[PDB]
Amino acid sequence: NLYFQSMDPLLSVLMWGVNHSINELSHVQIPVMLMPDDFKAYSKIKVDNHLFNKENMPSHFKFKEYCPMVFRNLRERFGIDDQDFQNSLTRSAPLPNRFHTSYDKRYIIKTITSEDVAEMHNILKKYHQYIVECHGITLLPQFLGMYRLNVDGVEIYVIVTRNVFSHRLSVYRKYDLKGSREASDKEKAKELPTLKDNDFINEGQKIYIDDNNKKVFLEKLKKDVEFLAQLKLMDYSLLVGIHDVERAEQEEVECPLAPGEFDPNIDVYGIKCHENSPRKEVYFMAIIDILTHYVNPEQYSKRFLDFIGHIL
Amino acid sequence: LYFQSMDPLLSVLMWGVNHSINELSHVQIPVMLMPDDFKAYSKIKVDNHLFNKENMPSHFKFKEYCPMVFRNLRERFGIDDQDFQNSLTRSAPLPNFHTSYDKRYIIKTITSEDVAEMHNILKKYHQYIVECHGITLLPQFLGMYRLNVDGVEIYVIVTRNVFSHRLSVYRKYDLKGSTVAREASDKEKAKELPTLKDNDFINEGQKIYIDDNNKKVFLEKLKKDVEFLAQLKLMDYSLLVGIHDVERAAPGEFDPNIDVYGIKCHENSPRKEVYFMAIIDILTHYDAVNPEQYSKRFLDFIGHIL
Numbered sequence A: 001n002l003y004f005q006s007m008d009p010l011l012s013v014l015m016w017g018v019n020h021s022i023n024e025l026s027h028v029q030i031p032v033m034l035m036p037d038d039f040k041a042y043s044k045i046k047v048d049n050h051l052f053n054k055e056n057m058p059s060h061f062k063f064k065e066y067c068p069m070v071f072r073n074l075r076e077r078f079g080i081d082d083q084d085f086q087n088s089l090t091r092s093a094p095l096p097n098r099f100h101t102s103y104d105k106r107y108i109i110k111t112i113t114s115e116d117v118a119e120m121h122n123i124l125k126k127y128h129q130y131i132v133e134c135h136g137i138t139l140l141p142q143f144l145g146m147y148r149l150n151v152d153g154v155e156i157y158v159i160v161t162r163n164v165f166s167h168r169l170s171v172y173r174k175y176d177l178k179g180s181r182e183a184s185d186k187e188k189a190k191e192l193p194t195l196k197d198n199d200f201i202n203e204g205q206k207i208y209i210d211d212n213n214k215k216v217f218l219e220k221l222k223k224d225v226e227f228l229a230q231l232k233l234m235d236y237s238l239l240v241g242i243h244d245v246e247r248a249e250q251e252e253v254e255c256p257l258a259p260g261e262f263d264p265n266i267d268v269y270g271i272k273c274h275e276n277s278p279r280k281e282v283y284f285m286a287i288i289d290i291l292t293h294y295v296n297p298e299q300y301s302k303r304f305l306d307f308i309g310h311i312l
Numbered sequence B: 001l002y003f004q005s006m007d008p009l010l011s012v013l014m015w016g017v018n019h020s021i022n023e024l025s026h027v028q029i030p031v032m033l034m035p036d037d038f039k040a041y042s043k044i045k046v047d048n049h050l051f052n053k054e055n056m057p058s059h060f061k062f063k064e065y066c067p068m069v070f071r072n073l074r075e076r077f078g079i080d081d082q083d084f085q086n087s088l089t090r091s092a093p094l095p096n097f098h099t100s101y102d103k104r105y106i107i108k109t110i111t112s113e114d115v116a117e118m119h120n121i122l123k124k125y126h127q128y129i130v131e132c133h134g135i136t137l138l139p140q141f142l143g144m145y146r147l148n149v150d151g152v153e154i155y156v157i158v159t160r161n162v163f164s165h166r167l168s169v170y171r172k173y174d175l176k177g178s179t180v181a182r183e184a185s186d187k188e189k190a191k192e193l194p195t196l197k198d199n200d201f202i203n204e205g206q207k208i209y210i211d212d213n214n215k216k217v218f219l220e221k222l223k224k225d226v227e228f229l230a231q232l233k234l235m236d237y238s239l240l241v242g243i244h245d246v247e248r249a250a251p252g253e254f255d256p257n258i259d260v261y262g263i264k265c266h267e268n269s270p271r272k273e274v275y276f277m278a279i280i281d282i283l284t285h286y287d288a289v290n291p292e293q294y295s296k297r298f299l300d301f302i303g304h305i306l
């Protein structure tokens, strides 16, 4: 069954605490609406086992969940069931790349600083009201839970976000895009380099989405980017993953959803290529890495939109 | 399920049992218990800030003693952990000790001396339950915990109800076979169900009518159980006897996998009755008449009344 075992005791506690958190919330009324106190709330749990479950789990740890009611509501508004979320993060250990990915590739887990946590509380009310008003249709990072772990006197804060990329379709090419930045020699020798602004230009990278999806996509991005500028946030990226249908076919032939198809209620950032693309590709594109508080944010926001618009 | 109660100690207990059993579903069923399992425990301390503030207290501790041992005893007593969790969780235990909402379990506040004395006997108790294959009139110890809330600390034990989860008891005796004054008070006797005692049993001319076979099997168990208690040098235990009157009314019947202490009366009983008989309240050590004597005086009496 589920033992939450890992060589990494921080992962064990994270799996245990997400399991704990979600079961706890199963015993707490879903409120008609969130209230101000829910934006300053937490749960702290300290465990001290003696000669009990000593092989699977560390015997001494702390787990703290920030604003559990808000992040439950955000999961709901982003179309996530708490049971599915719990399974995604606990049924098997998250895999490392620094970030981790849930075993089913739905979710990203990232270590963050206490400043980041303090800045999350600073934006949390405004972020939640924005998510309500766009009915959860945004390119913004979906913040799904936020925790503090302590084991063996090692303290970390972690955020969970939705994977920009597909849980199923492989990404053969990947870009972190800002505007106004090229991968190192070391980065480029990996299997999947995180390529950057100059790699995008100098490799002659094109993205082939039809006028309609381009308009829809640049309309969200403008709204999301203007919201980030009102918050006075900057140094955020567009993450672009490219799925090449034909490369994934030959990669697999060596060893019901058709090739180049995805479920848009799971792979929410997916966009099909247009009819006249030289190759059958699927693009996965959203905003990551939002949380730098004040170029100025106006300037950052306009340069970003201008660079993304000039590449489509 | 919100584990709501007017009594914050019941909420933590319900929360605690719910936590304890969910935890053990993430822990391997071992091939056998080992010595460290009789010294083990799990403590959880909870501190909430503006979260679940209405249903639950914001600050509490729950400790389970020897979790691996109590899970093994539940299984050896024919008790599934989910059904156990449900009996203690789906709805609050009712005060009279307390009874689970479905009347399957007793919940009782004990002292830290009681807790220390349970650890002292727990290895021998478990190995006794192994050797009698769960077939005993001893108390079934099903879990043992420590709760803190609002700086108030209690220890609690959970045992199986001697009485039925459905059939009513119209008459009830705490029997020891002590020669001394054992008589329920005038206050006790005015209650709807008084706990009657040895001299009430004799002075009321109470009869238990069970056939020669069930009496032999009952007295064989009681003897082995009571010789075990003497070996441990425990005393001051009682036979608890509940009598269900079938006539006040299928009527005569009960599931003997649920109500395990039930025994039907003799066919030639003048009154249709069902008897619920077992040992309670064993944890008094001699160190504090001796345990041999108590045990011998206790059996002579129970055999004297059947």
Ligand SMILES: CC[C@@H](Nc1c(C#N)c(-c2ccc(-c3cccc(C)c3F)cc2)nc2cnccc12)C(=O)O
Residues within 6 Å of the ligand: A098, A099, A108, A110, A112, A116, A120, A141, A159, A161, A162, A163, A164, A165, A176, A194, A239, A288, A289, A290, A291
């Ligand atoms: C290109 C970066 C990296 N992969 C990813 C990262 C990372 N890293 C993040 C991510 C999550 C959280 C933070 C974060 C950092 C600080 C504070 C707070 C709140 C945060 F959310 C920052 C970045 N999201 C991803 C979504 N989909 C796919 C890949 C992702 C890679 O492939 O190299």
Ligand SMILES: CC[C@@H](Nc1c(C#N)c(-c2ccc(-c3cccc(C)c3F)cc2)nc2cnccc12)C(=O)O
Residues within 6 Å of the ligand: B097, B106, B108, B110, B114, B118, B139, B157, B159, B160, B161, B162, B163, B174, B195, B240, B280, B281, B282, B283
């Ligand atoms: C006749 C007394 C009372 N009812 C009961 C009690 C009580 N009290 C107990 C009980 C449980 C635990 C301890 C205990 C006490 C100290 C230490 C440790 C470990 C213990 F288990 C002592 C007694 N069991 C019952 C089982 N079935 C039915 C009724 C029961 C009543 O009706 O008035």
